[PDB]
Amino acid sequence: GAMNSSNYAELFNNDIKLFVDDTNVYRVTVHKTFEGNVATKAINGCIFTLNPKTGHLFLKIIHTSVWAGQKRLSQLAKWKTAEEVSALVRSLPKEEQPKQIIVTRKAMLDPLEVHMLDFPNIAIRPTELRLPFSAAMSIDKLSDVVMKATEPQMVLFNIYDDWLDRISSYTAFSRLTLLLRALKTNEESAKMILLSDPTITIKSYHLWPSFTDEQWITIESQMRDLILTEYGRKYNV
Amino acid sequence: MNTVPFTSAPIEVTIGIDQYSFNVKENQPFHGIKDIPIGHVHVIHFQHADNSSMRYGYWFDCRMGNFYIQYDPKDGLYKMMEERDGAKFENIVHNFKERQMMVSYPKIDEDDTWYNLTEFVQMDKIRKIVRKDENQFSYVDSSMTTVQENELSDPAHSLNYTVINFKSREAIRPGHEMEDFLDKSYYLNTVMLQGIFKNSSNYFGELQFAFLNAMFFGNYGSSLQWHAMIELICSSATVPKHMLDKLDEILYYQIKTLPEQYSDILLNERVWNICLYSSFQKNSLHNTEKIMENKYPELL
């Protein structure tokens, strides 16, 4: 059944799984038309697919061309998401295929279950966590590849950089979720925290700066403060 | 007009005959039911006064043989049996009528309810859902499970309804996942109608049979089946016009006939609100929607 706080550490066992988030698949800008009405203009999106044990993000770039001449695009997006995930599961050998896929929004269950009928031994699960993966487009290098894409494309990223060299996947997942939660609650503050110090660089093959252990602890602290504050700033507390 | 004589009535029992029913007291002088209309299937069903658990009954067609009821004190239930000695049967029945120890099937001449509930139901199809081929009548009760329920345990005592499953490879063509799941026309028209049922009458016959078993026996798997077959039509954008019109009549009479107090367990809120208000056919079941809204507005 559903993934929640009580079965949280299942994410880091040795059963290969993926988290699928569809919150950035269908993205629009809303604008006024010459006649004064409102229209949407789609922009490129992505399916955020993350192996939570290793860090790999199988970013499938959704080019705006996929929507051309389609109706009910928010509903199609869930099915397009499902279709792309199923295709990844199919491209993979049986041993590498996920034993479970956890969708971050319950509206993905039926589309994915239907596209995955050929894989009855892959469990499709919802979660009760409020995971901040929608903020993945606040990671500059991810947003950049998505906005630059001229055609459908799948780019493989490691969303943990080299962290697993030094910390466990539980700890790397917590760091990631803290970073994403911060970026979602106040992207500007969050990004200032990450990039204030010029001497700490982002390696060309990485997504986040090359923080030492001690620098990560300060960063993690500052992101907490941000999140706690924004929560005050919001409710006045 | 046909007759189902009873040997006796040793235990207190509520006896049903189609949509009618009457109480028989323990060892009351009851020798069965006369004037049963030929041309329709019928169901005779039982609830013991002592154990309201397990309603049970027999589907039968008097054209298929001479049938009587005899209580079995070992198995503890009223059993249907066939009498092959047609002369002996007529003789016994004539005597029972003379002594007027039979109730009369109480059909009002204006009333087409039973015809309308069993229009498409045929004993030959009943006998394939309820497999017991040594007999010409079919036993059902409250606790029998469906072949589909057994997939999710005794195969001899199952209801072999047609398996409908909206999230199945049979329902979903590779390549038309979204299309076939949101518009089930392919599954209804090609897989089920053309492929399995062959025609809409056989489909409606199973649908009607599922409802009646749900109503008369509170058979849960039957109710699931009734609702599945309704939902498959309502979720198909492309349905022959005559099927829609007949579906509307079928459901109208079912809803009309349902006991007012049983609506909370026999009617799936989700299925009905979806069928009447969200589905492709939301505008195509005028009679059903009007009776539903005037009789069970709570559910909606």
Ligand SMILES: CCC[C@H](C)N(C)S(=O)(=O)c1ncn(C)c1Cl
């Ligand atoms: C469902 C996940 C399927 C992939 C192929 N994995 C087995 S992995 O995410 O652990 C992985 N391990 C190493 N790499 C480079 C990848 Cl990428």
